[PDB]
């Protein structure tokens with residue numbers, strides 16, 4: 001049985017090779033078991049400096065969510081996270097606005113909805129809108145990585161045409177698509 005919690009299933013991977021793009025991070029994910037798992041219940045991480053994969057920087061980055069880490073990973077030069085689960089969204093139009101260093105990819109119901117396929121110092125991108133056809137728990141996954149240096153990841157979502165944005169957190173996240181009461 002997979003645990004039911006109000007969050008996404010989180011996996012952290014570190015490496016001593018360079019992460020330049022999404023494909024490099026996905027290859028890392030596919031190469032081994034996660035270096036740590038966690039519950040991603042408040043997806044607003046960092047900012048910090050001096051490499052996410054070093055020392056206690058991952059704990060600092062994950063903040064509130066770090067108390068669910070399965071282990072304290074050892075040092076690596078580069079690292080990132082893979083998150084997967086469900087998010088409750090009513091039918092309608094939405095768009096992401098993401099602050100990040102380095103890059104990332106977010107997909108909903110299998111379709112990319114926010115992508116930066118390269119390294120970058122902290123930058124905020126307002127992404128194009130997408131539609132949700134039916135209200136309910138939508139499948140969502142996220143990739144984010146740090147190639148080194150500074151690191152931050154905050155993917156906010158608007159349901160009202162960019163007037164207001166919210167962080168994805170325990171109000172609407174579900175690890176399995178069942179309703180959490182936690």
Ligand SMILES: OC[C@@H](O)[C@H]1O[C@@H](O)[C@H](O)[C@@H]1O
Nearest residue numbers: 101102119120121148149150
């Ligand atoms: O590639 C752009 C560049 O600024 C990279 O160096 C870093 O320190 C920063 O966090 C970013 O990853």
Ligand SMILES: [Ca+2]
Nearest residue numbers: 029030032033
């Ligand atoms: Ca894996």
Ligand SMILES: [Ca+2]
Nearest residue numbers: 055072073074
């Ligand atoms: Ca560590």
Ligand SMILES: [Ca+2]
Nearest residue numbers: 044046063064
């Ligand atoms: Ca924090």
Ligand SMILES: [Ca+2]
Nearest residue numbers: 064065066067
């Ligand atoms: Ca906590």
Ligand SMILES: [Ca+2]
Nearest residue numbers: 018078147148
């Ligand atoms: Ca690197």
Ligand SMILES: [Ca+2]
Nearest residue numbers: 147148149150
């Ligand atoms: Ca960086």
